[PDB]
Amino acid sequence: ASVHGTTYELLRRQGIDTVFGNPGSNELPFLKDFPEDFRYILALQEACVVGIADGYAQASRKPAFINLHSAAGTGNAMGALSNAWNSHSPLIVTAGQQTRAMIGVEALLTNVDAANLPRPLVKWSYEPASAAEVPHAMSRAIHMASMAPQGPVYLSVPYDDWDKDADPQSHHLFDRHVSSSVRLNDQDLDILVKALNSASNPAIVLGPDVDAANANADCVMLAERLKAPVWVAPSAPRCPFPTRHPCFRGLMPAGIAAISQLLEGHDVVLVIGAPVFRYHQYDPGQYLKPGTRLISVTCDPLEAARAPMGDAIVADIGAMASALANLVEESSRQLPTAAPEPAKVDQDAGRLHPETVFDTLNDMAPENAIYLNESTSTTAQMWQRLNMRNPGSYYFCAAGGLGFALPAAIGVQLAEPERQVIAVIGDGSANYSISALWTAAQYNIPTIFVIMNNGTYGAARWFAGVLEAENVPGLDVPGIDFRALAKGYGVQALKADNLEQLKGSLQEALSAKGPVLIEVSTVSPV
Amino acid sequence: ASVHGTTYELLRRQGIDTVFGNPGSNELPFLKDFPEDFRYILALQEACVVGIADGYAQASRKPAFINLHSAAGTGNAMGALSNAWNSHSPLIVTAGQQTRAMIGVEALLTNVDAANLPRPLVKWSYEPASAAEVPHAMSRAIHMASMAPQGPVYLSVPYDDWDKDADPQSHHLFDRHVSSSVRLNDQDLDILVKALNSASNPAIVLGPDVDAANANADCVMLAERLKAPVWVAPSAPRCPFPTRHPCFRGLMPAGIAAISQLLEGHDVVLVIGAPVFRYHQYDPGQYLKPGTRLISVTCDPLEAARAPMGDAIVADIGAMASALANLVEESSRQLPTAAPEPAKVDQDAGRLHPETVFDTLNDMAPENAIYLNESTSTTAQMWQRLNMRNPGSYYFCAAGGLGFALPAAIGVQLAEPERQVIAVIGDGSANYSISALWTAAQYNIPTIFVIMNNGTYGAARWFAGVLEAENVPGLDVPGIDFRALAKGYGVQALKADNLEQLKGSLQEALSAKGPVLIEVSTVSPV
Amino acid sequence: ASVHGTTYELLRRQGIDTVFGNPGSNELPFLKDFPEDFRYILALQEACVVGIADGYAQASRKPAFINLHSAAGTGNAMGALSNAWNSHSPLIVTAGQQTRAMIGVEALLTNVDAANLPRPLVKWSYEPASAAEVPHAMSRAIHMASMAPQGPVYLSVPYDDWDKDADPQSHHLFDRHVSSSVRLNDQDLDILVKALNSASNPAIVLGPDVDAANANADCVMLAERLKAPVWVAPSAPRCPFPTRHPCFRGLMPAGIAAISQLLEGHDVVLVIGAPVFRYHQYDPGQYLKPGTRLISVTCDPLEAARAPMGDAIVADIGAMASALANLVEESSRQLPTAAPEPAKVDQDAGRLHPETVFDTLNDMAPENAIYLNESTSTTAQMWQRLNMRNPGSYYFCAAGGLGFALPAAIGVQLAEPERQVIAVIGDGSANYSISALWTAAQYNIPTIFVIMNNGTYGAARWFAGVLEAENVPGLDVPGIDFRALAKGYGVQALKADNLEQLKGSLQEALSAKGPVLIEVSTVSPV
Ligand SMILES: Cc1ncc(C[n+]2csc(CCOP(=O)(O)OP(=O)(O)O)c2C)c(N)n1
Ligand SMILES: Cc1ncc(C[n+]2csc(CCOP(=O)(O)OP(=O)(O)O)c2C)c(N)n1
Ligand SMILES: Cc1ncc(C[n+]2csc(CCOP(=O)(O)OP(=O)(O)O)c2C)c(N)n1
Ligand SMILES: [Mg+2]
Ligand SMILES: [Mg+2]
Ligand SMILES: [Mg+2]
Ligand SMILES: [Mg+2]
């Protein structure tokens, strides 16, 4: 059998049926005679390919396969790979390399020193020594991407490899099953459980890997058994907990001092599926105040190693959350009182306050809606004002790289056709991966895009204030007509200049069978 | 002084007065108190930032300075860096890093292992070990960018460095002159001149570094005294020769066998400022046919090392072209006859043959027009049909990475305000860096954007033919309205459904004071 | 032809006839049917293999070819490659790789991610994508190592490649000549010559690349015409000037303040073939005091870029030194007066002072002797007391990597059969590459090893004083019998406990036909 046939069989046999790509010559011998049980999703630029692929992988909780064109295509997608690195997204990124006969001469579209290009943003990067090796290399890619801690991997493949004979023994690869579904040994897990049982004022902190493990329900049960408040870890890329549960206390601010204060008076702090911690703003102080003991559970040794404080257990979040949920005694302490409802804000008949948008979305959106956030100055309000009961209801660019939410919303909507994806994106952020809209139109993926137009990079202006930066150029982005942009890529476009128009547009957007973009005129913070 | 003040003084004294960027928190302490004698050019995405800076750097023949945001911003720009790598574009790429105190905990927007990210696409890549080192590091960046072979470099700077005290001894950095304007020693140069004087049927092949060195006029002299036909080396990123000069023989096809067949009968082939060679399609055969001696003059050791044939001289192209032009005797042989005018392609009253568009541009565009090419299926015709008399008149993505021409056209126009820049871009290629249109609108940069809309990735279909690949998905890009895209970014948009509308639209765009986009309906190759 | 046959032809055709190696399974298909016109030099460990080739390459001023065993062998030589990096030694390091069929499974002696292993200490690092590419890859390594700035390169080759069919078009590789023999253009060179002619108190500073270029003779004539004093740049790996020429002022100390104090009063300082500067100890102050113009001529862009001060010309040192010596006017200033002869130190009938050893060596050694220094606390006294009239008379570990001198002494002696090599090596430093003694013995290479036994790491204790480091362990090395070690490896062993025995031992060493080690009891600094 050929490398072509063997590789598609391995993919198929390992559960892959969708290829996200932007093609070029070095990929044609891979893509030719594309099998009828595979689906190809074209995006017009490689940051969109990877973003779409990334949303699809996070929502489906399974590896996503990507096909890019050499160094240029791989390069265009590296910002997107930084997000995928931080979210532990199992992406199998493959890139076509020149024919082996011309790699030496460095013909046009040779990916020189290819394995080094995506580093340090990939778990594994490789160009096979021979055509026969390609299926084995792909096998490695697949398992490396899928093993905890999940993440992007990179395989460069010379285009002449596909027509060559596969390694005869390649069939051993098809049904290889690898498991990293592990948990702390019995003796040490009992010690942890006793520690949690003996705590007088436990707090829980939950990171994105809880939602990637679909460990949300076990964390609810753990929280209810320990009668403990629950915060989402800072810079949250996913929502690991129902936002209106009695225990839920919201998003931790991304600051050292803010978090030690929040955790003060809690004797044990159990962190699950999060870095300790993903701070953003510099807010020096104590990592922890006296009296506080931190225990981290993470699937990534890199996170465990770099924690400035606390103990760590490196294990599968799914397996550990389940184990802990079912092992901890029910505490006779009083269950936390639900956080109060956010106060409605004053809203005139003109431009919309972000708080008004999220209240309207919350009232009109279905209870199984999935929200994507790239409205970077409105994030704290969005967390207060959206009720998200279900797992897989929230995504935010995990490495802070803009151009994620728009394409990612298209991948999430593809992965979850029965759940309405609502992407809330700033006018700044929308431009990074704008051409992703075209995939929504061509493949008729019914994502709703709500562009929050305040005419500026609002969050940049906020940081300018916190860093006392005066006379900073390039913080405003006037003169962008997002309805024309939507129209350019064949997406239905609505305006929402006020609350009356917003409600009308959401009603029309929610019923639509294709993608809809709503341009909301929001109040600038200037 | 502060590291901030010392660094801007270094830039200023090194002739840098313009920052191309897309800002973020990590860049604010660098961009704050932006000096009044500096200019800041915002682009909405980093591939556009770098593309505009690259076009600018190539047209000005001076380094361009770039400021990006962490791993995300740098990542977004890497496809653009691979083009800059192949074009020897002197790009100084700076990226903001997290405060040194939070680099270890890997807070959000820590560029982890930063220096490795842009590798292998930069000459030099560095993160200073202290704030006081930053001006020295920047000095190194500037000189590494600017020394032959020119190319992109990378500096990651923790944002807390900028406010720190500068070393008073950093003042030595300000007026450093580094020269790489070198040529072959007298003895060996005379030997080369005698070989060229003794040649009975010499050929000259010119690459992009001739144009980058502005050695075009010297190569014209060299060609006229040797009475030698001149080709442009394959996959040409620039035009190093007047295309209607009697000696000019056209763009070499990007294939091994094709080139050796072309150079057959020429006893000495002098290659200047090009790789040997930038083949593209695999067209195996002889590198050189018997009887052809090849001598390459290159400013890049890496090119000289990887030539599969010939002698090489590593030296500055300008110093060497000038030396050779002046040292060679005038041959008594007859001057080559000018290539015949290309035949007029039959055109009906409907969709436009590409050949018709280039004929119209040639008849209507000014004689000092600058063209950029990202209409990938029409390159050979463009080269046959555009008369480019002057230096700096043609640009094409040097590593074949699409998303170059649109932003680069804006950079070129910025650097050359008195030369009309016309970017001929395919409908597929337009989408990679579409948001660069915004920068042309905001800064009123009067580039003409000619979108050749054939409904498809035509050059991919051509390679599918040559690779005998059938049932390849993702080769069609229907349903894109470019006039609506232009409108969304504030650029004036015209259509051209036929020859008369093309003429009218070009007349209107040529006289326009702002940027204009023309969507041309072109005949599809399918 | 085979890859094997074609590769040996290329090597042969490019002037290589000697292979320095330590063999293993992965290299046997390369080493088999070893040509009759090639020589193989075995060393017992890879630091010694590379040390010997380095000495050979430096003495011969030609590339040396090395063959090491996969990752462990390559890894063993990486300390030695750091020296080779710093001395710009043209080393072609090949390492055998596992058969391509077993790379993926990572069989024992798979060099995983091979090209990254020797980085960042190599100019070029590569594993070919196919067997047929190996000759081309070898061509690249050969030229990359040989081109200015010369340096070590690395090629990893799967062992199954050698028996495979080579491409017939690889014959074009055989006689490729690449020149980097370049100098500054006429116009800018005239400006420099005019500046040198106009200097009232010029100084010259010379570094190792002068010796490497064999530009010593031209620098003597340059110094004599400019009537200028001449220093060797600090931490000198080589000797670029006769040490008793009237202009010679000695080895600059490796500190910032000490060098600006030395250069004070010189209006123009011409630095040729050196970094600016290779400091060592931290001696903060001014890089250059006001009133001095520093002009650096360097073959290395990396050196040009990182100089804290001065202008730079990146050119070939031989071409430049020759150019300048012929272009400068003869100054009417008086020739500098020779520095005084050093004072005879007090010496009793017991342990030898280093000064006595070098005085005795100067008296007794032949005038064409070659000295290698790895006696680290006595370098200053060595430069004062040895008259080195000739080029190629001194070598010292260029990156400060101990274990260079002993093996490099053997390579130099092999390269220079008619010049007596005398390696002066401390008792600590002798141990790093002690096994190299065997190679001297086995190939009957008559190096003299003078071992300076002071029973301690002297220069470490010195630095311990300048750093005020008390209670530091591991500074003493008692209980090593170097005659026993010499006997162990079959090298004739003498001793010198006093001046009488030293004079007798050296007389014997100089007259001996094979290698000789002399263990000298020297006064300890403790
Ligand atoms: C690729 C990339 N470029 C730049 C940034 C820095 N950045 C953070 S927030 C921000 C502003 C985005 O503005 P907008 O989308 O309009 O949201 P708003 O702040 O106005 O709410 C920018 C440019 C980033 N994080 N990633
Ligand atoms: C970043 C990147 N992605 C993909 C490619 C592959 N590619 C080469 S040509 C081409 C066709 C572009 O089509 P278009 O711009 O419409 O011009 P046309 O081929 O129709 O003449 C594509 C997709 C590339 N070169 N670079
Ligand atoms: C591979 C390596 N290990 C350690 C050192 C540090 N080092 C520099 S000098 C020195 C002392 C060597 O002592 P010796 O050779 O006996 O000479 P002495 O200082 O006594 O003259 C040491 C350990 C080094 N430069 N390289
Ligand atoms: Mg905004
Ligand atoms: Mg990288
Ligand atoms: Mg097209
Ligand atoms: Mg010692």
Curated annotation (Swiss-Prot), chains A, B, C:
Class in the EC hierarchy, top level: lyase
Pathway(s) it belongs to: Aromatic compound metabolism; (R)-mandelate degradation; benzoate from (R)-mandelate: step 3/4
EC number(s) recorded for this UniProt protein: 4.1.1.7
Tagged with keyword Secreted: no
Catalytic activity entry: phenylglyoxylate + H(+) = benzaldehyde + CO2
GO BP term, example: mandelate catabolic process
UniProt cofactor(s): Ca(2+); thiamine diphosphate; Mg(2+)
A family per Pfam: TPP_enzyme_M
Entry keyword Glycosyltransferase: no
Residues that coordinate or bind Mg(2+): N116, L117, R119
Note on how the cofactor is bound: Binds 1 Ca(2+) ion per subunit. Binds 1 thiamine pyrophosphate per subunit.
Residues where Ca(2+) binds: D427, N454, T456
InterPro entries: DHS-like_NAD/FAD-binding_dom, THDP-binding, Thiamin_PyroP_enz_cen_dom, Thiamin_PyroP_enz_TPP-bd_dom, TPP-bd_CS, TPP_enz, TPP_enzyme_TPP-bd
Residue span of region Thiamine pyrophosphate binding: 376-459
Gene Ontology molecular function, alphabetical: acetolactate synthase activity; benzoylformate decarboxylase activity; flavin adenine dinucleotide binding; magnesium ion binding; thiamine pyrophosphate binding
Keywords of the record: Aromatic hydrocarbons catabolism, Calcium, Decarboxylase, Lyase, Magnesium, Mandelate pathway, Metal-binding, Thiamine pyrophosphate
Family as reported in the entry's similarity comment: Belongs to the TPP enzyme family.
Subunit note: Homotetramer.
Name of the protein described by the UniProt record: Benzoylformate decarboxylase
Gene field: mdlC
